[PDB]
């Protein structure tokens, strides 16, 4: 009763798949994204479950437009599904009025769609959470939107299984910066909360990943993390949780 | 249950329906089957039940054109849709090329039919809410691998075989076909075989108005055997039936 | 391009062309202008090359098609009203169409029809379709007869589309000559209308106005 | 030419006091050939008359129109059509076809049942309501009709006067058009009785 | 709509399918008999009830061509559904390939669409069993089908169909040769008579003869004249 | 175009029709039937613009003899006119406008009176007791209102159908090459060796 | 106003062998008195013994290729590895052709190899549709300069043997791949001289089973 | 997919349709409302309930015009007589005033609207629109006419009628009070003091909504200058005007 | 859940039978009488209506009687509601038989046309049948005066007297035992009332209850002139027959 569908409502003003389906996002990888004054700096947890895997090849990473990074958690497949419908989204803005899609613009789409998805019994609710954002020229934006179709702007944002461990850092990275910081300096504290909140993932190893979208460094385009920046990162991390 | 669905997975990790699909093969009025590089032949019982039936109008044999041929056993009800189908796609190569369409590529066609289940699976038009339930054997000869025998399933699949018998009595008979089978066979033995192991799941008189055989071969086409010849194949049974 | 066919006693002679122009000039000589509907049926090209081929392939299709499903060999009206009805629709979109079909039967005997672009279905012992049609005629005509041989049908078609050679631009080429029988179309070779005329002028006496 | 003018017919109405009267002539023809001398052009329900002129086929497949029209109409409020709810029917119908349009000019006369007032309306090919309350004349010999009735009336003819000044107006059109006249019937028509009345009129 | 009303049984069947053929056992009774020179269909008409015209009620054996005629076993509405379809095919036959229908073509249409309806998610074949007889234009020879709402069609030399065809059919073995059909027309009325007398009887009022013979003729003989085949019956 | 004559007599209706086929400038047949019965009881002829008529026959053809079968009943001749005159109504509006002429005789059986209807290609019924259409229609009308009286046999009728054609063959520069009689009569549709 | 059609030019010649054949073709491309284009040949190799051409407006002609080499691809993988025939070339370029036939292509295209009895075969298409096996077709616009010349030394037309004066006709020839290549750089070279739509270059593809070579040659400028 | 096509009515087993008996519980658990057919006018009346005492009443409607001549007035769910009142509105244009030019008659509008009632009861994703509505107006045809149109897509006319929970009371009060000939003033005065009894709210002309459709009005036609043509026969009577009859009971 | 919340009323019962069918039949029991009886001068068709109340205007009401054409009027009973869908889908039909043949619509037609919109409900859409039972009053030329019955399954059954709706059975008996084949009209409309009088519904028959209609061929020159009295037509002849 009041699971069968999402077209059932209970008396209690809750729909259940919907809220069923946050657990899937619970059983995802740690993603966080760090809104930084200047930009966004995102990490993602992408687990070594075997030495089969090659490293830095699978992207949870999918950019939309050319300034606005999407990175999630939850059902691998399902949030690509999303990001598919979004870039069709991103290219139709760019159609019409000749100008690359702002950050609150793109996340109202997106709402609809999965907004939409949770009425109709003909298309099955989403079981994804993504963090989302960048710079245009409205400011640098960070967006967290729920399965069940609810976003809002984020001073700091995580989900998957060690969302407690990052959120908890933001805090104090918070009370560290009451502005915020940098996007330079917030390289390094994206690996360190991921390096943390892989103490709920230290059953297993990890590749870290780390992407940014900065006015500062990046001229406000969403390029990737690597390199000789990403190993200062890494080491910056390592020595803060030893 | 997992039924009362089009493509609703059991746990078993395979269609329920198609199950059934499988368990409407038998049935079917024997559809035997031998194929050798002499020519293939296909028999096929009719089944009487009354001597006011008229049989010799009835056949499974089927023609698809002229270098294929068709037995069909199983829920024929079904069959009716596959073999228009089959009809038109060969139609429709001799249409595009002015070439003869090979006997793999004709049964992978049919095939194509056969997975229509669904009603809100991906963007291929449902022309069905459930699968099919009978099964083909498909002879043929192409001049690129020669003569060729295929067993397409309901499920949207399909083997090559060199002898299939399908229907009701299938098991029966395919305990016959392993012993019975070789390379060394003769059209004309060939032809003994089939009703040899269409007697034992015959529940009647083997006789020339309740089975009928066919063959095909590259210089006579698709021939229809007239009840006369069945009639003497028949009797030649009898007297390899004295010789034990 | 000039094409015939005439019922007789014997079935039915198909006799055809092989010139083929494009312009004032002659594209080709060697331009078939029969094409075999099926083992007991030909069909006659005339009116656009394109149209005419294409759809005397599909009827053939739907010829197997009807000889499955029947179980017996289709009616030759049956074939003829098929094809119309089909140009009948591209009737105010522009095709271009002349067949005679011709088939030889068990249950209605030689029959010819000639379909149109505009869908017309005629019944007919005789037709002469193309740009020496008139020339066709005139001798065919005078020498027809309902009654007659099958060596002298096969002179007959040889003559008339020699005429037509003869007097029109676009004609000539070689000769095909089909018997169209009961138990289906029998081929009678190629024979060159090069050849043909002096041969011809020698043996019957004519074309004297012509210099020799 | 014009699908119009092709066929030619001509419709006459006029108003009276406690009456009404509408007319044609016979003549149906195509193009230069008449065809028939057989073919009326007057139909009727209820007390509500219709002449139709213009395109033939136009003329016929109207006429059954306005029958299918009628009788759901009829059934629906279970009392006869009314002269004024009529105009508005055919106004509304003659602009579906706007484009690939009507050819026709339709004539409404009938007598108000309500008020027991001579009502009359024209139409047109696109089809518009044409009020008057002295004559109606619609067709190709209209423009000569236009003319003629003018001439001849005066306001609030008795029946019988009614009769005599809009049987000539007809004859005189109508054997000066070609594709007009070869016959005339006039109908009279009361409150209470309609007599058809046929004119004896000169072959043309 | 696409909600599946054909769903796939646990025995390799169609629910519906199976359900039809209880329709057909509540239906009415047709039987068919060929002879050497004819095809005779008779049928249970159901008009026990006092105070019913017969002019007017529609007909159990209805013509669709001039020597080719349908007649059903099942459901009283949902046998029109194929009469008026039989019809239209017969009218587009005549137009595009010339030449009455056969009965063949017509077999091959009816289970058209029992077996569209059959396999498709919406829709529900009808309840209907039917007999398609008669001949074909240039040919003597009696042709006798069956479609069944399964659509699949079977040959017959004689047949019934609909209630307690079962023992009707066993009746007709005995009276009945493959080898030697009804040489006589006469001898085939009263076949058909004999196995409607064992369920429909009514006297007469309830017994339908329609007999065909080549040369494009039908004809339909009333309770009156078919009185006269029952007391021949007696009597034998 | 092709000739089509009507007359209507007071037993029976007669049709007649051209036998000649002429496509482009050449003659193909000479000898054609161009008229196929609808109805038992009701025939039509067609003439008008090449193969427009023959498609559009057949068609109507089937179109009538659907209701017929169904019902068990044949259409009354002012009927079966009133359609055919629906669909050349639409046809002209339709994307190619169908040109066929053609004039529907028949018996009416339950008036059980003979009537005779002219049917162009616009779509306008027309009773008459005579008609035509084509060029050749025009010269064969005076003659038809000569000698038409109203208490016709078949056979003075006949005769007067000889004169109409006699006198198409010196007016009319095109040779039709005699043409097809025959009667429509409450007996059925029977045809007379008689042009 | 706007013509979607135009001309490009260009000129091929097809001969079908015994057991080869040679489709050849000019490497110019040209509109009106322009040369677009010095080298770019118009004839491809489609693989698997099959060579097309699609000679005269460029656009079109192109677009059958495309869609046929697609259609080679789909032979193998959906009629399951099975050698594509010039028989069944042939048809499938004709559906490519009467399909636009309302908004007309304009290529005389021609299919060139070896048929499954190991000899040359030829077929030339109308720019709709419709196609006979010929010995010899030429196409493109110095069509008819080439024509009647490759016919009286490859089927020797209007030859007869040395002093029988029109008695017994010089018969028909056995041919080679070599003899061949002589006349198509004969006449290829005229037509340079007395058409302005030929030159450039000259690749000359000869189809075997052995393989399938191109050969190039050099033409005048002019 | 979306494969919501079947309907979501359905036979009951001892007969009935199970789901008009549902909607028309729901007609029972609304206002009261009723109308009295004078033989000079109409009076239709309804009593006014609120969500909040801070809302008002004076924006809140129960009786709409459909057409001029013609209005209507329900008892049931809000939400249901809401959207049906503008389809109302809307097949009275599209279909007689886009054919007829006209404004239709009372019998006409009312037939029509019960087929928008029929789909709503066939097909799935609707059910059916649980009021039932009283159609009081005047046409030149067929005179006064009082309409009850069902949640089952029927009506029926009437000489004087209620719907809501009070219904059965209103009309028992009204047997006794209606007469063969009727003045419009007297109408009145029976139609709230019917209502009284079956209002368990204030019995001011603030919280009862009366309007007639008595006699014509011309100088709310919004134009002068035609004899001919007829204005408004409905009037809306304000608060201050109800609370003048109240005192003339 | 798009098929967890359909129930599937378009199916048979294992007895080959629509419940929806069968339910329709027992909801058109709560409608009250309507008789049809075929004298051979007209047809009579009564009907007393399922709602009286003495506020309720029954002067106007319609509720039994509808015109599909001015030859053909039915009787209804069932619901009004859901009788009045086909009411108006039969007025178009009919009329649109008018506009192409220029010829009334034979009463057969059109009550076959109906009857199929019945079963295309079941047939498809997951829709139910509109339960209505009509009694058809209709007059042709080729049969004369024809009377039918339809049910909601769409199906027609010809009838010389007949009573759907409350107390059928016991209309029925009246009518089988009074009939005679050589009735007029007026010996029928007395036939009709007293049959009203005893399956009346009330304790007592009254004129403003009951719509009575004929469709008489008194009417000169052969035509069919249908009236439909008024109640206080009914009264006179309610004291005819002496019910009053």
């Known amino acids: 009763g009041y699971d069968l569908s999402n077209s059932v409502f209970s008396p209690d003003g809750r729909n259940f ?125 960070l967006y967290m939107l729920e399965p069940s179709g609810s976003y809002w702007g984020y001073k700091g944002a995580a989900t998957g299984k060690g969302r407690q461990s990052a959120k908890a850092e933001l805090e104090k990275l918070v009370d560290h910066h009451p502005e915020g910081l940098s996007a330079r300096e917030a390289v390094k504290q994206a690996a360190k909360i991921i390096y943390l909140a892989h103490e709920d993932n230290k059953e297993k190893d990890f590749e870290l990943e780390i992407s940014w979208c900065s006015l500062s460094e990046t001229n406000g385009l969403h390029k990737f993390v690597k390199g000789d920046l990403l190993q200062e990162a890494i080491d910056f991390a390592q020595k803060e949780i030893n | 249950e997992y039924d009362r669905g089009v ?53 499974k044999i089927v023609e698809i054109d002229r270098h294929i041929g068709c037995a069909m056993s199983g829920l024929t009800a079904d069959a009716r849709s596959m073999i228009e189908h089959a009809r038109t796609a060969a139609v429709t190569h001799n249409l595009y090329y002015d070439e003869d369409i090979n006997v793999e590529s004709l049964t992978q066609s049919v095939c194509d039919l056969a997975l229509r289940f669904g009603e809100g699976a991906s963007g291929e038009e449902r022309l069905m809410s459930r699968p099919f339930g009978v099964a083909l054997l498909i002879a043929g000869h192409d001049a690129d691998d020669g003569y060729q025998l295929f067993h397409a399933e309901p499920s949207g699949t399909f083997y090559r075989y060199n002898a299939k018998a399908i229907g009701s009595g299938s098991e029966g008979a395919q305990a016959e076909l392993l012993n019975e089978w070789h390379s060394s066979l003769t059209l004309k033995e060939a032809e003994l075989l089939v009703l040899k192991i269409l007697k034992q799941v015959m529940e009647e008189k083997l006789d020339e108005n309740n089975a009928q055989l066919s063959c095909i071969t590259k210089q006579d086409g698709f021939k229809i055997y007239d009840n006369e010849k069945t009639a003497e194949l028949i009797k030649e049974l009898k007297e390899k039936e004295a010789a034990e | 391009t000039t094409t015939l066919a005439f019922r007789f006693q014997g079935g039915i002679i198909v006799a055809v062309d092989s010139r083929a122009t494009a312009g004032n000039w002659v594209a080709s000589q060697t331009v078939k202008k029969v094409i075999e509907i099926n083992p007991f049926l030909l069909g006659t090209m005339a009116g656009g090359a394109a149209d005419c081929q294409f759809w005397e392939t599909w009827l053939g299709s739907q010829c197997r098609l009807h000889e499955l499903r029947e179980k017996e060999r289709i009616s030759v009206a049956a074939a003829s009203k098929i094809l119309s009805n089909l140009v009948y629709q591209y009737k105010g979109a522009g095709l271009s169409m002349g067949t005679m079909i011709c088939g030889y039967t068990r249950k209605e005997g030689p029959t010819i029809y000639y379909v149109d672009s505009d869908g017309t279905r005629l019944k007919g012992d005789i037709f002469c379709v193309g740009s020496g049609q008139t020339f066709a005629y005139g001798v065919l005509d005078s020498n027809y007869k309902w009654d007659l041989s099958v060596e002298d049908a096969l002179y007959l078609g040889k003559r008339s589309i020699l005429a037509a050679a003869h007097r029109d631009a676009y004609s000539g080429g070689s000769v095909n000559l089909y018997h169209v029988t009961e138990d289906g179309w029998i081929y009678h070779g190629n024979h060159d209308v090069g050849e043909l005329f002096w041969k011809v002028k020698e043996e019957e006496g004519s074309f004297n106005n012509v210099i020799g | ?113 309500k008020s027991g007032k001579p009502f009359i309306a024209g139409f047109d090919l696109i089809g518009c309501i044409d009020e008057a309350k002295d004559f109606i004349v619609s067709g190709t010999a209209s423009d000569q009709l236009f003319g003629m009735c003018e001439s001849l009336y005066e306001p609030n003819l008795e029946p019988e006067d009614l009769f005599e000044t809009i049987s000539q107006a007809l004859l005189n059109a109508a054997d000066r058009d070609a594709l007009s006249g070869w016959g005339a019937v006039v109908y009279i028509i009361k409150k209470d009785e309609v007599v058809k009345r046929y004119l004896k009129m000169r072959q043309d | 709509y696409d909600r599946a009303l054909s769903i796939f049984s646990p025995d390799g069947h169609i629910f519906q399918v199976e359900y039809a053929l209880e329709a057909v056992k509540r239906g009415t009774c047709a039987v068919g008999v060929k002879g050497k020179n004819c095809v005779v269909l008779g049928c249970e008409r159901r008009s026990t009830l006092k105070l019913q015209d017969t002019r007017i009620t529609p007909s159990k054996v209805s013509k669709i061509d001039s020597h080719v005629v349908l007649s059903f076993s099942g459901l009283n509405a949902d046998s029109r559904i194929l009469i008026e379809k039989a019809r239209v095919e017969a009218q587009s036959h005549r137009l595009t390939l010339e030449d009455p229908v056969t009965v063949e073509y017509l077999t091959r249409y009816v289970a058209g669409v029992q077996q569209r309806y059959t396999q498709s998610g919406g829709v529900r074949p009808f309840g209907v069993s039917t007999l398609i007889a008669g001949f074909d234009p240039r040919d003597d020879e009696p042709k006798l089908y069956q479609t069944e709402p399964s659509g699949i069609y079977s040959s017959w030399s004689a047949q019934t169909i609909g209630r307690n065809s079962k023992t009707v059919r066993e009746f007709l073995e005995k009276n009945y040769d493959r080898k030697e059909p009804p040489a006589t027309v006469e001898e085939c009325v009263k076949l058909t008579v004999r196995s409607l007398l064992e369920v429909v009887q009514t006297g007469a009022k309830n017994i339908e003869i329609t007999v065909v013979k080549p040369d494009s003729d039908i004809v339909a003989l009333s309770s009156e004249e078919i009185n006269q085949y029952v007391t021949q019956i007696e009597q034998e | 175009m092709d000739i089509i004559l009507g007359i209507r007599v007071q037993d029976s209706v007669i049709l007649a029709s051209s036998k000649a086929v002429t496509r482009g400038i050449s003659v193909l047949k000479d000898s054609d039937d161009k008229t196929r019965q609808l109805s038992p009881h009701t025939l039509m002829s067609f003439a008008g613009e090449a193969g427009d008529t023959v498609q559009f026959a057949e068609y109507i053809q089937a179109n009538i003899q659907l209701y017929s079968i169904r019902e068990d009943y044949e259409l009354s001749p002012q009927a079966v006119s009133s359609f055919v005159r629906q669909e050349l109504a639409k046809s002209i509006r339709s994307r190619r406008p169908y040109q066929v002429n053609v004039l529907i005789g028949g018996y009416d059986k339950k008036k059980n009176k003979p009537e005779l209807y002219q049917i162009d290609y616009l779509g306008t019924k027309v009773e008459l007791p005579y008609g035509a259409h084509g060029y050749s229609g025009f010269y064969t009308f005076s003659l038809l209102d000569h000698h038409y009286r109203p208490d016709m046999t078949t056979e003075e009728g006949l005769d007067l159908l000889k004169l109409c054609v006699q006198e198409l063959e010196k007016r009319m520069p095109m040779d039709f090459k005699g043409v097809i009689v025959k009667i429509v009569d409450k007996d059925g549709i029977r045809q007379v060796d008689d042009f | 106003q706007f013509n979607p059609y135009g001309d490009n030019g260009g000129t091929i010649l097809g001969i079908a062998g015994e057991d080869f054949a040679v489709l050849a073709g000019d490497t110019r491309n040209i509109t009106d008195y322009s040369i677009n284009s010095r080298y770019e040949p118009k004839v491809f190799d489609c693989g698997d013994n099959i060579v097309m051409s699609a000679n005269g407006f460029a656009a079109d002609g192109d677009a059958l290729v495309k869609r046929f080499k697609n259609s080679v691809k789909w032979y193998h993988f959906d009629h399951n590895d099975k050698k594509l025939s010039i028989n069944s070339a042939a048809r499938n370029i004709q559906h490519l052709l009467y399909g636009k036939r309302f908004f007309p292509y304009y290529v005389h295209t021609i299919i060139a190899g070896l048929d499954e009895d190991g000899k040359g075969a030829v077929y030339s298409f109308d720019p709709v549709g419709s196609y006979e096996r ?31 004066n029109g008695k017994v006709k010089k018969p028909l020839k056995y041919l080679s791949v070599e003899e061949v290549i002589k006349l198509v750089r004969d006449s290829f070279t005229s037509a340079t001289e007395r058409h302005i739509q030929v030159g450039d270059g000259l690749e000359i593809l000869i189809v075997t089973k052995d393989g399938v070579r191109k050969e190039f040659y050099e033409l005048k400028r002019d | 997919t979306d494969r919501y096509s079947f309907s979501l009515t359905t036979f009951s087993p001892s007969g009935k349709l199970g789901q008009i008996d549902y909607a028309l519980t729901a007609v029972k658990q609304g206002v009261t409302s009723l109308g009295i057919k ?93 009021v039932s509505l009283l159609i009081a107006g005047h046409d030149e045809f067929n005179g006064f006419s009082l309409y009850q149109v069902d949640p089952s897509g029927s009506y029926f006319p009437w000489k004087a009628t209620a719907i809501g929970k009070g219904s059965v009371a209103a009309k028992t009060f009204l047997e006794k009070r209606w007469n063969d000939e009727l003045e419009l003033e007297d109408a009145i005065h029976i139609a709230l003091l019917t209502l009284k009894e079956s209002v368990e709210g204030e019995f001011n002309g603030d919280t009862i909504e009366l309007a007639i459709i008595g006699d014509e009005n011309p100088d709310l036609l919004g134009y002068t200058g035609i004899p001919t043509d007829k204005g408004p026969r409905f009037r809306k009577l304000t608060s201050q005007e109800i609370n003048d009859r109240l005192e003339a009971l | 859940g798009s098929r967890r919340y359909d129930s599937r009323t378009t199916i048979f019962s294992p007895e080959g039978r629509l419940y929806q069918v069968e339910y329709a039949l027992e909801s058109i029991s709560h409608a009250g009488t309507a008789i049809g009886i075929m004298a051979s001068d007209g047809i009579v068709l009564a009907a007393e209506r399922k709602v009286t109340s003495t506020l309720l205007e029954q002067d106007t009401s319609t509720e039994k009687l509808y015109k599909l054409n001015d030859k053909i009027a039915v009787a209804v009973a069932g619901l009004t509601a859901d009788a009045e869908i086909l009411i108006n889908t039969a007025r178009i039909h009919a009329q649109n038989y008018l506009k192409t043949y220029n010829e009334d619509i034979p009463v057969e037609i059109l009550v076959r046309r109906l009857s199929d919109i019945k079963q295309g409900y079941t047939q498809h859409g997951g829709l139910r049948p509109f339960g209505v039972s009509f009694i058809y009053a209709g007059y042709d030329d080729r049969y004369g005066y024809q009377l039918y019955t339809s049910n909601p399954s769409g199906n027609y059954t010809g009838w010389k007297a007949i009573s759907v709706g409350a107390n059928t059975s016991a209309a029925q008996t009246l009518l089988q035992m009074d009939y005679k084949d050589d009735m007029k009209v007026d010996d029928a409309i007395e036939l009709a009332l007293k049959t009203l009088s005893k399956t009346t519904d009330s304790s007592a028959l009254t004129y403003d209850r009951l719509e009575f209609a004929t469709i008489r061929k008194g009417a000169n020159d052969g035509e069919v002139y249908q009236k439909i009295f008024k109640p206080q037509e009914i009264k006179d002849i309610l004291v005819k027959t002496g019910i009053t």
């Open chain 1, 17 to 141: 798949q919907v809220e069923y389906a946050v657990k899937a996002v619970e059983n995802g990888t740690t993603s966080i994204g760090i809104k930084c004054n200047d930009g966004v700096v995102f990490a993602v947890e992408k687990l070594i479950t075997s030495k089969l895997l090659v490293p830095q090849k699978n992207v949870k990473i999918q950019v939309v437009d050319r300034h606005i990074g999407c990175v999630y958690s939850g059902l691998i497949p399902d949030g690509r599904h999303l990001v598919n419908r979004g870039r069709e989204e991103a290219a139709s803005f760019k159609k019409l009025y000749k100008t690359p899609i702002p950050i609150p613009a793109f996340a109202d789409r997106l709402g609809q769609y999965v907004q939409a998805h949770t009425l109709y019994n003909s298309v099955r609710p989403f079981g994804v959470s993504t963090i989302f954002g960048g710079v245009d020229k409205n400011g640098a934006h």
């Open chain 2, 7 to 59: 493509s609703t997975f059991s746990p078993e990790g395979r269609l329920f329906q198609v199950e059934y699909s499988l368990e409407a093969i038998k049935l079917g009025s024997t559809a035997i089957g031998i194929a050798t590089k002499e020519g293939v032949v296909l028999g096929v019982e009719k089944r009487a039940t009354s001597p006011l039936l008229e049989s010799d109008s009835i056949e």
């Open chain 4, 1 to 113: 030419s014009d699908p119009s003018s092709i066929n030619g017919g001509i419709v006459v109405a006029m108003t009276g006091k406690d009456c009404v009267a509408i007319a044609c002539d016979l003549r149906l023809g195509s193009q230069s050939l008449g065809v028939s001398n057989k073919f009326e052009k007057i139909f009727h329900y209820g007390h509500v008359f219709l002449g139709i002129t213009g395109l033939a086929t136009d003329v016929t497949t109207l006429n059954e129109m306005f029958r299918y029209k009628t009788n759901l109409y009829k059934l629906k409020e279970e009392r006869a059509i009314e002269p004024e709810t009529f105009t508005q029917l055919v106004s509304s119908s003659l602009y579906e076809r706007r484009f690939g349009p009507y050819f026709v000019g339709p004539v409404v006369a009938g007598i108000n049942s």
């Open chain 7, 134 to 164: 010929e010995q010899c077709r030429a196409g493109g616009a110095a069509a008819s300069l080439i024509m009647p010349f490759l016919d009286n030394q490859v089927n020797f037309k209007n030859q007869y043997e040395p002093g029988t």
């Open chain 8, 38 to 130: 004078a033989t000079n006018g109409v009076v239709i009346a309804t009593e006014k309930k609120s969500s909040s005492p801070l809302a008002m009443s004076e924006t809140l409607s129960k009786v709409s015009l459909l057409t001029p001549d013609i209005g209507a007035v329900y008892s049931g769910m809000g939400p249901d007589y809401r959207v049906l009142v503008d389809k109302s509105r809307k097949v009275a244009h599209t279909s007689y005033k886009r054919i007829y030019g006209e404004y239709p008659p009372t019998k006409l509008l009312v037939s029509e609207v019960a087929k928008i009632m029929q789909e709503a009861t066939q097909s799935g994703g609707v059910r059916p629109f649980g």
